[PDB]
Protein backbone atom coordinates (compact mmCIF):
# COMPACT_ATOMS: atom_id res chain seq x y z
CA UNK A 1 0.00 0.00 0.00
CA UNK A 2 0.96 3.63 -0.44
CA UNK A 3 -0.36 4.56 3.04
CA UNK A 4 1.46 2.93 5.97
CA UNK A 5 -0.28 1.76 9.08
CA UNK A 6 1.30 2.27 12.51
CA UNK A 7 0.33 0.91 15.92
CA UNK A 8 0.66 2.17 19.50
CA UNK A 9 0.20 -0.22 22.46
CA UNK A 10 -0.99 2.22 25.22
CA UNK A 11 -0.32 1.58 28.94
CA UNK A 12 -1.66 3.45 31.99
CA UNK A 13 0.89 3.53 34.80
CA UNK A 14 2.59 0.41 33.43
CA UNK A 15 -0.62 -1.53 32.85
CA UNK A 16 -1.78 -2.46 29.35
CA UNK A 17 -4.83 -0.46 28.10
CA UNK A 18 -5.07 -1.38 24.43
CA UNK A 19 -3.83 -0.90 20.85
CA UNK A 20 -4.54 2.03 18.57
CA UNK A 21 -3.64 1.85 14.93
CA UNK A 22 -3.45 4.66 12.42
CA UNK A 23 -3.59 5.15 8.67
CA UNK A 24 -0.96 7.64 7.64
CA UNK A 25 -1.91 9.67 4.53
CA UNK A 26 1.39 9.40 2.65
CA UNK A 27 -0.54 9.95 -0.50
CA UNK A 28 -1.35 13.59 0.57
CA UNK A 29 1.43 14.51 3.11
CA UNK A 30 4.31 12.18 2.46
CA UNK A 31 6.95 14.08 4.40
CA UNK A 32 4.83 14.42 7.56
CA UNK A 33 3.57 10.75 7.26
CA UNK A 34 7.16 9.44 6.86
CA UNK A 35 8.30 11.36 9.96
CA UNK A 36 5.63 9.82 12.16
CA UNK A 37 6.13 6.34 10.59
CA UNK A 38 9.87 6.36 11.16
CA UNK A 39 9.49 7.68 14.72
CA UNK A 40 7.00 4.83 15.32
CA UNK A 41 9.43 2.10 14.24
CA UNK A 42 12.49 3.46 16.08
CA UNK A 43 14.45 2.94 12.80
CA UNK A 44 16.43 6.22 13.21
CA UNK A 45 17.53 5.12 16.69
CA UNK A 46 15.05 7.29 18.57
CA UNK A 47 11.31 7.70 18.56
CA UNK A 48 8.00 7.23 20.26
CA UNK A 49 8.48 3.92 22.10
CA UNK A 50 8.33 4.65 25.82
CA UNK A 51 7.01 8.21 25.50
CA UNK A 52 3.98 9.65 26.98
CA UNK A 53 0.75 11.49 26.26
CA UNK A 54 1.73 14.53 28.23
CA UNK A 55 -1.38 16.67 27.53
CA UNK A 56 -4.91 15.34 27.40
CA UNK A 57 -7.93 17.64 27.25
CA UNK A 58 -11.22 15.86 27.45
CA UNK A 59 -13.56 16.73 24.61
CA UNK A 60 -10.67 18.14 22.51
CA UNK A 61 -7.55 15.99 22.00
CA UNK A 62 -4.76 13.75 23.28
CA UNK A 63 -1.24 15.04 22.60
CA UNK A 64 2.05 13.23 22.72
CA UNK A 65 5.32 12.70 20.88
CA UNK A 66 7.74 14.61 23.08
CA UNK A 67 10.24 11.88 23.50
CA UNK A 68 13.18 14.10 24.33
CA UNK A 69 11.83 16.10 27.31
CA UNK A 70 8.53 14.33 28.10
CA UNK A 71 6.68 17.54 28.92
CA UNK A 72 5.79 19.35 25.71
CA UNK A 73 8.91 21.41 25.35
CA UNK A 74 10.90 18.83 23.30
CA UNK A 75 10.63 16.36 20.40
CA UNK A 76 12.51 16.24 17.15
CA UNK A 77 11.81 15.18 13.63
CA UNK A 78 13.71 12.72 11.49
CA UNK A 79 14.92 15.57 9.30
CA UNK A 80 17.58 16.94 11.65
CA UNK A 81 15.56 20.23 11.96
CA UNK A 82 11.96 21.29 12.46
CA UNK A 83 10.14 21.07 9.16
CA UNK A 84 7.60 23.08 7.19
CA UNK A 85 3.79 22.67 7.15
CA UNK A 86 3.58 20.42 4.20
CA UNK A 87 -0.03 21.43 3.25
CA UNK A 88 -3.44 22.01 4.84
CA UNK A 89 -5.41 19.93 2.37
CA UNK A 90 -6.90 17.53 4.94
CA UNK A 91 -9.31 18.80 7.55
CA UNK A 92 -9.96 18.22 11.23
CA UNK A 93 -13.34 16.58 10.59
CA UNK A 94 -13.90 14.60 13.81
CA UNK A 95 -12.68 12.07 16.36
CA UNK A 96 -9.65 10.14 15.39
CA UNK A 97 -7.92 12.70 13.20
CA UNK A 98 -4.18 12.64 13.65
CA UNK A 99 -2.50 16.03 13.32
CA UNK A 100 0.81 17.80 14.02
CA UNK A 101 1.24 19.81 17.12
CA UNK A 102 3.26 22.94 16.64
CA UNK A 103 4.41 26.23 18.14
CA UNK A 104 3.66 28.39 15.12
CA UNK A 105 3.82 28.03 11.36
CA UNK A 106 6.47 25.72 9.99
CA UNK A 107 7.70 24.38 13.30
CA UNK A 108 6.84 20.65 13.05
CA UNK A 109 8.96 18.28 15.10
CA UNK A 110 7.64 15.09 16.70
CA UNK A 111 4.62 16.21 18.72
CA UNK A 112 1.19 15.19 17.48
CA UNK A 113 -2.40 15.04 18.65
CA UNK A 114 -5.31 12.76 18.28
CA UNK A 115 -8.69 14.63 18.08
CA UNK A 116 -11.55 13.38 20.18
CA UNK A 117 -14.06 15.85 18.67
CA UNK A 118 -14.52 17.93 15.55
CA UNK A 119 -11.90 20.76 15.87
CA UNK A 120 -12.54 22.67 12.65
CA UNK A 121 -10.89 25.87 13.87
CA UNK A 122 -7.56 24.08 13.63
CA UNK A 123 -7.75 23.81 9.80
CA UNK A 124 -4.87 25.82 8.30
CA UNK A 125 -2.97 25.87 11.64
CA UNK A 126 -2.06 22.15 12.15
CA UNK A 127 -1.19 19.63 9.42
CA UNK A 128 -3.58 16.67 9.34
CA UNK A 129 -1.71 13.52 8.37
CA UNK A 130 -3.60 10.38 9.45
CA UNK A 131 -6.52 8.86 11.22
CA UNK A 132 -7.23 6.25 13.78
CA UNK A 133 -8.13 2.89 12.10
CA UNK A 134 -8.65 0.57 15.06
CA UNK A 135 -8.91 1.50 18.70
CA UNK A 136 -10.87 4.64 18.88
CA UNK A 137 -12.36 3.26 22.01
CA UNK A 138 -8.82 3.16 23.49
CA UNK A 139 -8.36 6.88 22.65
CA UNK A 140 -11.69 7.60 24.27
CA UNK A 141 -10.48 5.74 27.36
CA UNK A 142 -7.21 7.74 27.35
CA UNK A 143 -9.32 10.90 27.43
CA UNK A 144 -10.60 10.08 30.88
CA UNK A 145 -7.12 10.63 32.28
CA UNK A 146 -7.00 14.24 31.18
CA UNK A 147 -8.16 17.54 32.61
CA UNK A 148 -9.26 20.98 31.51
CA UNK A 149 -5.64 22.23 31.37
CA UNK A 150 -4.28 18.99 30.01
CA UNK A 151 -2.50 17.60 33.09
CA UNK A 152 -2.89 13.85 33.17
CA UNK A 153 -3.94 11.92 36.29
CA UNK A 154 -1.83 8.84 35.47
CA UNK A 155 1.19 8.16 33.19
CA UNK A 156 -0.23 7.37 29.71
CA UNK A 157 2.58 5.68 27.75
CA UNK A 158 3.32 4.21 24.34
CA UNK A 159 4.59 0.92 25.78
CA UNK A 160 5.34 -0.31 22.22
CA UNK A 161 4.83 0.92 18.68
CA UNK A 162 5.72 0.04 15.14
CA UNK A 163 4.49 -0.49 11.62
CA UNK A 164 1.87 -3.07 10.76
CA UNK A 165 3.07 -4.74 7.62
Amino acid sequence: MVNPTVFFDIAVDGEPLGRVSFELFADKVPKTAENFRALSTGEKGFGYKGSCFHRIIPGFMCQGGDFTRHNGTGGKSIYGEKFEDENFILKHTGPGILSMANAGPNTNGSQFFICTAKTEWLDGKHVVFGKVKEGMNIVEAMERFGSRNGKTSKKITIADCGQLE
Binding site: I57, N102, A103, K125, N149, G150
Partner: protein, 135 residues
Protein backbone atom coordinates in the same frame (compact mmCIF):
# COMPACT_ATOMS: atom_id res chain seq x y z
CA UNK B 1 -14.68 49.03 27.77
CA UNK B 2 -14.27 52.56 26.28
CA UNK B 3 -11.44 53.68 23.99
CA UNK B 4 -9.27 56.64 25.12
CA UNK B 5 -11.07 59.97 25.05
CA UNK B 6 -10.58 63.04 22.86
CA UNK B 7 -10.29 65.12 26.01
CA UNK B 8 -7.51 62.88 27.40
CA UNK B 9 -5.82 63.15 24.05
CA UNK B 10 -6.15 66.95 23.96
CA UNK B 11 -4.35 67.13 27.29
CA UNK B 12 -1.55 64.86 26.08
CA UNK B 13 -1.06 66.94 22.93
CA UNK B 14 -0.85 70.03 25.18
CA UNK B 15 1.79 68.33 27.26
CA UNK B 16 3.88 67.35 24.33
CA UNK B 17 3.72 70.78 22.61
CA UNK B 18 5.19 72.79 25.47
CA UNK B 19 7.31 70.70 27.74
CA UNK B 20 9.88 69.67 25.17
CA UNK B 21 11.03 66.22 25.84
CA UNK B 22 11.69 67.37 29.31
CA UNK B 23 11.54 64.93 32.23
CA UNK B 24 8.05 66.08 33.01
CA UNK B 25 6.52 64.30 30.06
CA UNK B 26 7.09 60.97 31.75
CA UNK B 27 4.83 61.40 34.78
CA UNK B 28 2.19 63.08 32.56
CA UNK B 29 2.33 60.18 30.14
CA UNK B 30 1.80 57.77 33.03
CA UNK B 31 -1.22 59.61 34.45
CA UNK B 32 -2.95 59.99 31.13
CA UNK B 33 -2.45 56.31 30.18
CA UNK B 34 -4.01 54.75 33.32
CA UNK B 35 -5.77 51.51 32.23
CA UNK B 36 -4.90 51.96 28.56
CA UNK B 37 -5.00 49.06 26.18
CA UNK B 38 -2.14 48.86 23.67
CA UNK B 39 -4.51 50.48 21.15
CA UNK B 40 -4.96 53.41 23.47
CA UNK B 41 -1.18 53.79 23.85
CA UNK B 42 -0.70 53.84 20.06
CA UNK B 43 -3.51 56.36 19.81
CA UNK B 44 -1.73 58.66 22.24
CA UNK B 45 1.55 58.22 20.41
CA UNK B 46 -0.07 58.82 16.99
CA UNK B 47 -1.24 62.20 18.09
CA UNK B 48 2.40 63.37 18.23
CA UNK B 49 3.10 65.18 15.02
CA UNK B 50 6.59 65.82 14.05
CA UNK B 51 9.26 64.99 16.48
CA UNK B 52 10.12 62.32 13.98
CA UNK B 53 13.67 61.48 15.20
CA UNK B 54 12.38 61.13 18.74
CA UNK B 55 9.50 59.01 17.63
CA UNK B 56 12.02 56.73 15.89
CA UNK B 57 14.07 56.39 19.13
CA UNK B 58 10.88 55.28 20.87
CA UNK B 59 10.05 52.77 18.17
CA UNK B 60 13.53 51.26 18.38
CA UNK B 61 13.13 50.74 22.12
CA UNK B 62 9.63 49.16 21.61
CA UNK B 63 11.12 46.90 18.92
CA UNK B 64 13.96 45.86 21.27
CA UNK B 65 11.65 45.23 24.19
CA UNK B 66 9.18 43.23 22.10
CA UNK B 67 12.01 40.89 20.93
CA UNK B 68 13.31 40.49 24.50
CA UNK B 69 9.77 39.60 25.60
CA UNK B 70 9.58 36.97 22.92
CA UNK B 71 12.94 35.47 24.02
CA UNK B 72 11.86 35.20 27.66
CA UNK B 73 8.35 33.90 26.84
CA UNK B 74 8.51 31.11 24.29
CA UNK B 75 5.21 29.98 22.79
CA UNK B 76 3.77 26.74 24.25
CA UNK B 77 3.08 23.87 21.88
CA UNK B 78 -0.46 24.20 20.51
CA UNK B 79 -3.13 23.41 19.64
CA UNK B 80 -4.57 26.02 21.92
CA UNK B 81 -7.08 24.57 24.49
CA UNK B 82 -10.58 25.61 23.59
CA UNK B 83 -11.84 28.48 25.69
CA UNK B 84 -8.29 29.89 25.64
CA UNK B 85 -6.12 32.46 23.96
CA UNK B 86 -2.64 32.28 22.53
CA UNK B 87 -0.10 33.73 24.96
CA UNK B 88 0.73 37.17 23.61
CA UNK B 89 3.94 37.87 21.62
CA UNK B 90 5.89 41.11 21.71
CA UNK B 91 4.03 42.37 18.64
CA UNK B 92 0.71 41.67 20.33
CA UNK B 93 1.68 43.58 23.44
CA UNK B 94 2.66 46.60 21.24
CA UNK B 95 -0.66 46.42 19.43
CA UNK B 96 0.72 45.87 15.95
CA UNK B 97 -0.42 42.30 15.28
CA UNK B 98 -3.25 42.23 17.81
CA UNK B 99 -6.83 43.59 17.94
CA UNK B 100 -8.75 45.16 20.87
CA UNK B 101 -10.87 42.40 22.31
CA UNK B 102 -7.65 40.48 21.59
CA UNK B 103 -6.01 43.01 23.99
CA UNK B 104 -8.88 43.09 26.52
CA UNK B 105 -9.06 39.34 27.12
CA UNK B 106 -5.43 39.15 28.30
CA UNK B 107 -6.07 42.02 30.59
CA UNK B 108 -9.07 40.23 32.15
CA UNK B 109 -7.92 36.55 32.39
CA UNK B 110 -7.17 34.67 35.65
CA UNK B 111 -4.54 35.80 36.49
CA UNK B 112 -4.25 38.55 33.88
CA UNK B 113 -1.53 39.22 31.37
CA UNK B 114 -1.62 43.02 31.62
CA UNK B 115 -0.58 43.77 28.05
CA UNK B 116 -1.29 47.50 28.49
CA UNK B 117 0.92 47.81 31.54
CA UNK B 118 3.75 45.91 29.89
CA UNK B 119 3.62 48.01 26.70
CA UNK B 120 3.47 51.12 28.97
CA UNK B 121 6.74 50.12 30.62
CA UNK B 122 8.37 49.81 27.23
CA UNK B 123 7.07 53.25 26.17
CA UNK B 124 8.44 54.62 29.38
CA UNK B 125 11.84 53.31 28.70
CA UNK B 126 11.71 54.85 25.23
CA UNK B 127 10.66 58.22 26.70
CA UNK B 128 13.64 58.07 29.09
CA UNK B 129 15.94 57.50 26.06
CA UNK B 130 14.40 60.59 24.44
CA UNK B 131 14.74 62.70 27.55
CA UNK B 132 18.44 61.80 28.01
CA UNK B 133 19.18 62.65 24.38
CA UNK B 134 17.47 66.00 24.24
CA UNK B 135 17.69 67.32 27.79
Amino acid sequence: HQAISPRTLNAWVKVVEEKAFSPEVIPMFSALSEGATPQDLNTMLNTVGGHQAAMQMLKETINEEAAEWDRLHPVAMGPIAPGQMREPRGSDIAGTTSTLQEQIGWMTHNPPIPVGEIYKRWIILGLNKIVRMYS
